[PDB]
Short mmCIF file of C-alpha atoms and ligand atoms in Angstrom, two decimals:
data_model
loop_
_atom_site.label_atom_id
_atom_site.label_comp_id
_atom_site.label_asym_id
_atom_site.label_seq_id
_atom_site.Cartn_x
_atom_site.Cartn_y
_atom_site.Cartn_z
CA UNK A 4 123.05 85.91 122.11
CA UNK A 5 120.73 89.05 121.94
CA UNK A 6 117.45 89.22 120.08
CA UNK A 7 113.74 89.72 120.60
CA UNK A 8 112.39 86.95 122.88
CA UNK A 9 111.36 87.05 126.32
CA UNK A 10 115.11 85.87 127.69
CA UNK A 11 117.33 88.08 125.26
CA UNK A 12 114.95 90.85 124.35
CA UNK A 13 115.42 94.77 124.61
CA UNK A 14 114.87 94.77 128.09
CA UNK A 15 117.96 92.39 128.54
CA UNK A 16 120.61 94.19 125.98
CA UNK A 17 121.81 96.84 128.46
CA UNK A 18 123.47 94.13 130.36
CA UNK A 19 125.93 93.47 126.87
CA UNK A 20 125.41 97.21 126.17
CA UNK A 21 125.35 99.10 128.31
CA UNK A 22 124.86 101.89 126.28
CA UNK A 23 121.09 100.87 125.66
CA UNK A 24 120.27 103.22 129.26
CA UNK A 25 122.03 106.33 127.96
CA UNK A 26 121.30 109.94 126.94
CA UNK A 27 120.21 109.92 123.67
CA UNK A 28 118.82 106.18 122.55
CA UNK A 29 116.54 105.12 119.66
CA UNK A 30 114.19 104.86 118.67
CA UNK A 31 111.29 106.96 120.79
CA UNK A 32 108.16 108.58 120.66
CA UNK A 33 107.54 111.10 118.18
CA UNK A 34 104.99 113.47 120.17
CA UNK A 35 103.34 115.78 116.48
CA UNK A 36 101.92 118.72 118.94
CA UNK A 37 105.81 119.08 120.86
CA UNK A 38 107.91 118.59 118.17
CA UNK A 39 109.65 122.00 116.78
CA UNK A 40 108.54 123.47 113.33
CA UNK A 41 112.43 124.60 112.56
CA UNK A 42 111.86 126.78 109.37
CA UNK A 43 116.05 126.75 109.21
CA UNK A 44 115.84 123.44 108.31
CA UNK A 45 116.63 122.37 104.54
CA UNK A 46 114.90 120.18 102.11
CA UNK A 47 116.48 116.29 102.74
CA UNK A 48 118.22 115.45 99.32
CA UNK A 49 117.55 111.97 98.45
CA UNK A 50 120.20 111.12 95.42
CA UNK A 51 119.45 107.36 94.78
CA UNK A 52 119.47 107.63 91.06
CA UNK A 53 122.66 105.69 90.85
CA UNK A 54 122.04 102.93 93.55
CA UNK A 55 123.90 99.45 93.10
CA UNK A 56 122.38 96.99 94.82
CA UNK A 57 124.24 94.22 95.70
CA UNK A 58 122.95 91.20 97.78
CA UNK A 59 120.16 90.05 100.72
CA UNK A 60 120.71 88.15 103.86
CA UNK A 61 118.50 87.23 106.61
CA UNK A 62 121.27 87.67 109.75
CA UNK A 63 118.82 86.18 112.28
CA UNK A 64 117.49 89.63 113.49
CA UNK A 65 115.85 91.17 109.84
CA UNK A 66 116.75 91.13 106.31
CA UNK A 67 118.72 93.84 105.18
CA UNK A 68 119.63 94.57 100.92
CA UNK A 69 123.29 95.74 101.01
CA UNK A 70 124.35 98.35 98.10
CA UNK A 71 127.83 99.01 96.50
CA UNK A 72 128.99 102.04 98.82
CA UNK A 73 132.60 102.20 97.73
CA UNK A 74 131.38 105.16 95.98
CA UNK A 75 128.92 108.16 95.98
CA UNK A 76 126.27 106.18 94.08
CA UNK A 77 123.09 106.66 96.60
CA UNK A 78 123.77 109.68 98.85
CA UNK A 79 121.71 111.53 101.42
CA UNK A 80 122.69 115.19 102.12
CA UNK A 81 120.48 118.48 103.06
CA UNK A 82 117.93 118.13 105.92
CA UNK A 83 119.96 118.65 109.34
CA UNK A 84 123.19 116.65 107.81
CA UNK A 85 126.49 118.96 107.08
CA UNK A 86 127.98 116.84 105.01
CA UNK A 87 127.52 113.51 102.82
CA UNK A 88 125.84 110.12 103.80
CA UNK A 89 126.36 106.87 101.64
CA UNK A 90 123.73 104.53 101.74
CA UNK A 91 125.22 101.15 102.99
CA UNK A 92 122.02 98.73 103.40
CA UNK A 93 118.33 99.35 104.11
CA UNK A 94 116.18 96.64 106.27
CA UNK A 95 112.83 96.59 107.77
CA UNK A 96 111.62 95.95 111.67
CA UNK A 97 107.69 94.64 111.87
CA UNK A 98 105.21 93.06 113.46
CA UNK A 99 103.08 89.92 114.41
CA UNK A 100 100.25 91.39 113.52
CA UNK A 101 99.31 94.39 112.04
CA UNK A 102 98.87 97.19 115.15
CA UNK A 103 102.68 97.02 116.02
CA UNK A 104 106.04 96.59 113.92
CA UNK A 105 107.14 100.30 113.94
CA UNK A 106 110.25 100.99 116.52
CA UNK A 107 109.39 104.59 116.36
CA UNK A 108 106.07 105.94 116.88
CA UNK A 109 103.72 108.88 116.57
CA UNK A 110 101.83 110.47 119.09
CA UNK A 111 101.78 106.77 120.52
CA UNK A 112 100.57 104.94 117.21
CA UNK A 113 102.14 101.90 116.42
CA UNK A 114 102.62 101.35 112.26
CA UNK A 115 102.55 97.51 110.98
CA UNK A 116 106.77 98.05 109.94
CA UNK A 117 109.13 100.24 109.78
CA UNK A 118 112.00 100.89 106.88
CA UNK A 119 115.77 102.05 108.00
CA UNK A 120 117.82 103.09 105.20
CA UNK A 121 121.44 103.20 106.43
CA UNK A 122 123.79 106.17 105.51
CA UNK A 123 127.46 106.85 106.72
CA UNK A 124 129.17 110.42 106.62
CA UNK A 125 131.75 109.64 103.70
CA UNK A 126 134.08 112.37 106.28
CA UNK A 127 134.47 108.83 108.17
CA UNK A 128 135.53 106.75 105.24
CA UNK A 129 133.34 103.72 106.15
CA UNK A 130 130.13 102.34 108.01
CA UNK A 131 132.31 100.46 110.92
CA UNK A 132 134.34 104.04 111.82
CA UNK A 133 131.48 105.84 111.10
CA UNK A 134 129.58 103.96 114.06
CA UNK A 135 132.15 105.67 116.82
CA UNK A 136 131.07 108.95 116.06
CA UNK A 137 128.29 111.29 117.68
CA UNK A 138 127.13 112.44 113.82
CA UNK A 139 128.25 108.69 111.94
CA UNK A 140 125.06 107.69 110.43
CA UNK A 141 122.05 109.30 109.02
CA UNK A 142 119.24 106.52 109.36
CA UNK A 143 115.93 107.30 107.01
CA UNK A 144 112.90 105.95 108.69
CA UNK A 145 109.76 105.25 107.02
CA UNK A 146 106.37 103.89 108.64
CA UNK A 147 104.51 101.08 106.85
CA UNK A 148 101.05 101.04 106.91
CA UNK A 149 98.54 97.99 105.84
CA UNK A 150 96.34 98.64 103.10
CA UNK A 151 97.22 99.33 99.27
CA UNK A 152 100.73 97.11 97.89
CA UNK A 153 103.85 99.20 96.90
CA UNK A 154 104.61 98.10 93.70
CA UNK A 155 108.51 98.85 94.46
CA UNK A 156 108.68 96.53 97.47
CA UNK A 157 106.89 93.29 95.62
CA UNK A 158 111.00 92.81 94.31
CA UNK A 159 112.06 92.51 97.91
CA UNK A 160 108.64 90.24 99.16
CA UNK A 161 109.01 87.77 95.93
CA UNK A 162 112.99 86.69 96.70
CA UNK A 163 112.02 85.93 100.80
CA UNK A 164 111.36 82.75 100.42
CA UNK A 165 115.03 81.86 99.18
CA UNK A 166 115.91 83.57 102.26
CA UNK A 167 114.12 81.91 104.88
CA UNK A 168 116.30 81.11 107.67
CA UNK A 169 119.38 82.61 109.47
CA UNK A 170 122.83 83.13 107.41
CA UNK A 171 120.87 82.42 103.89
CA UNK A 172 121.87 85.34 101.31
CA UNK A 173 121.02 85.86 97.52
CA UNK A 174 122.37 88.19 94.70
CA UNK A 175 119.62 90.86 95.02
CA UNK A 176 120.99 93.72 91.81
CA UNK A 177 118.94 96.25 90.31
CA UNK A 178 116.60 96.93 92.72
CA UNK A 179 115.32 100.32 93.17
CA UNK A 180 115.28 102.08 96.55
CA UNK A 181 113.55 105.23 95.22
CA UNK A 182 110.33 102.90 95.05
CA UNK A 183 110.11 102.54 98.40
CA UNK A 184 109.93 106.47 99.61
CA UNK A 185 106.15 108.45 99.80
CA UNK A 186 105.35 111.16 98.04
CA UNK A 187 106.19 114.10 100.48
CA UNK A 188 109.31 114.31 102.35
CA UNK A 189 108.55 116.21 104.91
CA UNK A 190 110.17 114.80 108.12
CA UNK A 191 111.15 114.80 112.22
CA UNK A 192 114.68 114.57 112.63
CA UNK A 193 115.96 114.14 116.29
CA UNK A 194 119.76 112.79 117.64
CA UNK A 195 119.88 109.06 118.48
CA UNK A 196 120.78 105.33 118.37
CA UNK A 197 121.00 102.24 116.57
CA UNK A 198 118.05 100.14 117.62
CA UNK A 199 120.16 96.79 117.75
CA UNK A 200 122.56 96.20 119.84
CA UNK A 201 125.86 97.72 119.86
CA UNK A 202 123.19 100.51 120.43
CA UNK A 203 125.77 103.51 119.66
CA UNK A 204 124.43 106.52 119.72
CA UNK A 205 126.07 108.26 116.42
CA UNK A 206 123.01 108.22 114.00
CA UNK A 207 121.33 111.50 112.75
CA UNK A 208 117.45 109.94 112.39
CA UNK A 209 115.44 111.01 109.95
CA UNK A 210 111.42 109.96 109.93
CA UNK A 211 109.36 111.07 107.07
CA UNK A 212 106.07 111.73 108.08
CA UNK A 213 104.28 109.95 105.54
CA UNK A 214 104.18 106.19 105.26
CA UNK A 215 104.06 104.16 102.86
CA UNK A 216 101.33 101.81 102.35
CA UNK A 217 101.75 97.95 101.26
CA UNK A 218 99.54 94.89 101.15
CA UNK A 219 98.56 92.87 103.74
CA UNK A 220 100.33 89.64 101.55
CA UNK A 221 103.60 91.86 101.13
CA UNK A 222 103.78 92.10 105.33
CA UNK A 223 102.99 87.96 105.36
CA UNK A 224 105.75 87.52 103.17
CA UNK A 225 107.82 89.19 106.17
CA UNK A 226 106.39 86.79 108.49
CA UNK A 227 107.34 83.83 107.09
CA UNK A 228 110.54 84.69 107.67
CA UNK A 229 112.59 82.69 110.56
CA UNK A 230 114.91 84.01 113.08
CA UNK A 231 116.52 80.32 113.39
CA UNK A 232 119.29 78.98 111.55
CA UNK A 233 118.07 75.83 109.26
CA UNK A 234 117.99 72.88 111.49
CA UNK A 235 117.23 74.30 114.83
CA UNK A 236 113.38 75.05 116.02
CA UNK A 237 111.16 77.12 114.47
CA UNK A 238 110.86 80.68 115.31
CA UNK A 239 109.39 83.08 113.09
CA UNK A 240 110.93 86.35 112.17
CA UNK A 241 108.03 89.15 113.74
CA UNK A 242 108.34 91.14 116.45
CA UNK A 243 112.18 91.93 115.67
CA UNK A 244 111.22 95.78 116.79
CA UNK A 245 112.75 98.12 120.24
CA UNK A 246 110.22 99.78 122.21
CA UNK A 247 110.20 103.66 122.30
CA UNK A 248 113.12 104.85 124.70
CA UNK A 249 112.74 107.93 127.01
CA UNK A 250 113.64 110.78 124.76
CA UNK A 251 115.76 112.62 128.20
CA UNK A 252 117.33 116.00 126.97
CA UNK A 253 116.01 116.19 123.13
CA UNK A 254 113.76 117.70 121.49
CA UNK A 255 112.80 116.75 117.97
CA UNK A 256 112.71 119.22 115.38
CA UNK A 257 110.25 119.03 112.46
CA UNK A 258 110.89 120.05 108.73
CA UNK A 259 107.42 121.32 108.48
CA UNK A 260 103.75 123.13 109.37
N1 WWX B 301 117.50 99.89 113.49
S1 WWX B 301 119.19 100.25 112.98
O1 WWX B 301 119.27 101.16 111.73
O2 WWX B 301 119.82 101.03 114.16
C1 WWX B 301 119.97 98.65 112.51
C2 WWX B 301 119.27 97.45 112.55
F1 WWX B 301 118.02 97.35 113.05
C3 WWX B 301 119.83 96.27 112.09
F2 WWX B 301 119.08 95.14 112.18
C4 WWX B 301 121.12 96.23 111.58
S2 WWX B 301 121.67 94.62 111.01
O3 WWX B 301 123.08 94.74 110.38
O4 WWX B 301 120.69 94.25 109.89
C5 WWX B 301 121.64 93.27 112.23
C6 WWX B 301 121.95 93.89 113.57
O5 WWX B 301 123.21 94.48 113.40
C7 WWX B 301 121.87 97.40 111.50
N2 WWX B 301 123.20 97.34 110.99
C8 WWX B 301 124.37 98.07 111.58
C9 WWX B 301 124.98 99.01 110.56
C10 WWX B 301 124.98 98.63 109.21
C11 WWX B 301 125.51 99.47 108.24
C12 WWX B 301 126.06 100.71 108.65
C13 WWX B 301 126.05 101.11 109.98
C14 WWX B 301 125.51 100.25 110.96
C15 WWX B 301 125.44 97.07 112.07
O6 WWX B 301 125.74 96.19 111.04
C16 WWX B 301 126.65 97.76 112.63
C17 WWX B 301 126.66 98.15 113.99
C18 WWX B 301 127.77 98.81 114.56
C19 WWX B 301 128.87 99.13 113.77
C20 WWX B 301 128.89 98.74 112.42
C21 WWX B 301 127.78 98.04 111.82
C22 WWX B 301 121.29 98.58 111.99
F3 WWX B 301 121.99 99.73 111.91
ZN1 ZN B 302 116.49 99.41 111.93
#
């Protein structure tokens, strides 16, 4: 099946999906000087005050924390959404070492990881039909840097290692999601993908401009994670990141300067 290794990789996916060559994939390049001050744009509304976490799972390609979405609890709105977005499940992408992790990046610059929070427009009813359509998903993206720990991620880091290989899960309640986001919200917003395959191009992406820093043993804790399911080879989790895809007819729109 598809992941991140030299046989299976993103290079390969467009022969399952062949979606992963069209018009408007994910993630890409975020070029600062090009992208489009739009001063129409509207302050993103993060509403995560009433967030239910539910559970984590390694599924062989990340980890992701799934949250209690069967109703507005945790909702995105404003920015460039019309509408509603209920977040379904965050999950991170990184690296192997500490200059690459990020899917998207900025004027070329790689960050160490990158954080997707999941939203689906609650017009749609649910993630799955949410996925078939061209404005489906709002996607939050946030860059992680190496240097200083984020107190609100050490939750996520200390429960990894009862996670370690593919298919494990844990109850994972109470956590926090608003101690994961920077200070400013300013943001690029631009139309895309999912980054993993089916690849369908219905999410809204939204990519603050400020990362986050966290600690260099926070990011090993990523790392010791394993793509394999217990009982086959060892394969560490790292690298589980797409490469920028040519951005074709968009332009990217920024929130600010
Ligand atoms: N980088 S990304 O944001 O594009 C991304 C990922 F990188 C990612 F790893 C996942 S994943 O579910 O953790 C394993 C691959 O599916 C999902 N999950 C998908 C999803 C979950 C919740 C709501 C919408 C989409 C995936 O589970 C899915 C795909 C297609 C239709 C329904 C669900 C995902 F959306
Ligand atoms: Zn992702």
């Amino acid at each position: 099946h598809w992941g991140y290794g030299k046989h299976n990789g993103p290079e390969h996916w467009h022969k399952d999906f062949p979606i992963a060559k069209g018009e408007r994939q994910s993630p890409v390049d975020i070029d600062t000087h090009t992208a489009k001050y739009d001063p129409s744009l509207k302050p993103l509304s993060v509403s995560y005050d009433q967030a239910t976490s539910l559970r984590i799972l390694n599924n062989g390609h990340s980890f992701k924390v799934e949250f209690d979405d069967s109703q507005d609890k945790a909702v995105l709105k404003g920015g460039p959404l019309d509408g509603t977005y209920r977040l379904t499940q965050f999950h991170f992408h990184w690296g192997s070492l500490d200059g690459q992790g990020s899917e998207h990046t900025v004027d070329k610059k790689k960050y160490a990881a990158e954080l997707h929070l999941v939203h689906w427009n609650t017009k749609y009813g649910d993630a799955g039909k949410a996925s078939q359509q061209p404005d489906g998903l709002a996607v939050l993206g946030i860059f992680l840097k190496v240097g200083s720990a984020k107190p609100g991620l050490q939750k996520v880091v200390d429960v990894l290692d009862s996670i370690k290989t593919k298919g494990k899960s844990a109850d994972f309640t109470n956590f926090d999601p608003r101690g994961l986001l920077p200070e400013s919200l300013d943001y690029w917003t631009y139309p895309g993908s999912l980054t993993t395959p089916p690849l369908n191009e219905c999410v809204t992406w939204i990519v603050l401009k400020e990362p986050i820093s966290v600690s260099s043993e926070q990011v090993l804790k990523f790392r010791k994670l394993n793509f394999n399911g217990e009982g086959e080879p060892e394969e560490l989790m790292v690298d589980n990141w797409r490469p920028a895809q040519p951005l074709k007819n968009r332009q990217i729109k920024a929130s600010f300067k």
